[PDB]
């Protein structure tokens, strides 16, 4: 989040977070993080869950253009630079970055695409910038109707308002299925009560029941046991296994 370097909304940077203890209060407590919108999860509960995998994306876009960052949206960014899957789960985070990314008729380093030969697939990345073919006129060199270069810049002049001022965006994509998990909040553990009716939270799986030493041979690569109708029949302790 605090890295000085943020990539363009195409060829967007992607960082995998694994084997750590997260603390999302350090994020939404920040003043500049004016926009904090989440789909499939709420800001208050982020610190209580545990995630099987975590991926973070980042890029720079306009202010009003952040509207396009949502599941199944359509637009220049949503279709030709960065597209979220319709069933995306995670949070979208953006904040003002004029103090960094705004320059008088400058800031070319932050780019995007107005049009592309085809709409991007979800989380699809394209490093190339080849010219769109005109079709009606042979075009290997530059040409008219459609052989214009896809990339183009805002120029991020400070005179711009929020409609064109730079916004620094970081998107968290999560898989919220249960263990195996390696990234989640600082929730403290507790001793494991057995043979007594007890409320249990095994790696984010909340429930009420009696815990007994299981006698079914779990293979070493299995981490859960489901009875009929998706009910969790058994679970392995993430500490003593």
């Amino acid at each position, epitope marked *: 989040f605090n890295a000085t370097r943020f990539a363009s909304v195409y060829a967007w940077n992607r960082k995998r977070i694994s084997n750590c203890v997260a603390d999302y209060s350090v994020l939404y407590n920040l003043a500049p993080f004016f926009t904090f919108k989440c789909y499939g999860v709420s800001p208050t509960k982020l610190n209580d869950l545990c995630f099987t995998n975590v991926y973070a994306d980042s890029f720079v876009i306009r202010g009003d253009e952040v509207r396009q960052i949502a599941p199944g949206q359509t637009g220049n960014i949503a279709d030709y630079n960065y597209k979220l899957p319709d069933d995306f789960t995670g949070c979208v985070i953006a904040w003002n970055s004029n103090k960094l990314d705004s320059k008088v008729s400058g800031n*070319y380093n932050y780019l995007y695409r107005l049009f592309r030969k085809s709409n991007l697939k979800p989380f699809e990345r394209d*490093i190339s*910038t080849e010219i769109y073919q005109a079709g009606n006129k042979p075009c290997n060199g530059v040409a008219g109707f459609n052989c214009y270069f896809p990339l183009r810049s805002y120029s991020f002049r400070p005179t711009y308002g929020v409609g064109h001022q730079p916004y620094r965006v970081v998107v968290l994509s999560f898989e919220l299925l249960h263990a195996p998990a390696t990234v989640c909040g600082p929730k403290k553990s507790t001793n494991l009560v057995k043979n007594k009716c007890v409320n249990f939270n095994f790696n984010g799986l909340k429930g009420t029941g009696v815990l007994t030493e299981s006698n079914k041979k779990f293979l070493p690569f299995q981490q859960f046991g489901r009875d009929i109708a998706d009910t969790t029949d058994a679970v392995r302790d993430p500490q003593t296994l």
Partner: antibody
Amino acid sequence: QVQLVQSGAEVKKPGSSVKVSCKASGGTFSSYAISWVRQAPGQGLEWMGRIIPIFGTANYAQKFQGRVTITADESTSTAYMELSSLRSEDTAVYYCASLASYSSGWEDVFDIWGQGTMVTVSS
Amino acid sequence: DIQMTQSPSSLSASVGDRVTITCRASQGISSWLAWYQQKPGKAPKLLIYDASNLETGVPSRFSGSGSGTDFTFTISSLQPEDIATYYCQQYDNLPLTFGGGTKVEIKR
């Protein structure tokens, strides 16, 4: 891989315009861009301008607008810098370097550099 | 255009000694700074692209730190290839500006 090779030293009398150029190799022309910097004797560097040939966009430092123009083409895959109305003080070496603020979101600090072209102005 | 000044202008230290360099700016740049080493009259070699990140292939011998209107550049050991002028490159704004350079010569 991308590399730069510059033209030879060019010389002419004061008050004229000096040409300078350097080839674009590696990748191709439309995935490339150039800026030019000055290194006069007994001092540090200085930045003249920048071009992205396929954008048509170019910029020059406050010290060099009007006196400087930039052009490039894909047929020869090279950049064409020109400086006009030279003083005797303009005697310096001019470097063209690969641009980075042309795409995919890294910054404008020059990684690949040319060999340097010497221009000396005298009667 | 925003200027910067390098202080002190000249240094002298023996090979193996720790050396530090600093430069001064009139207005606060938001960490948009880079550092170069140049042999007098030769092509500069790029060292630091982000205020505290070395460039590809740069030895760990080089480093720097600082914030706001000022920054500092230091080396853990003055080595044989070190008689050169060190420039702090400002790129906060479109008009690029370069420092006066700090020169170091072997202390004999």
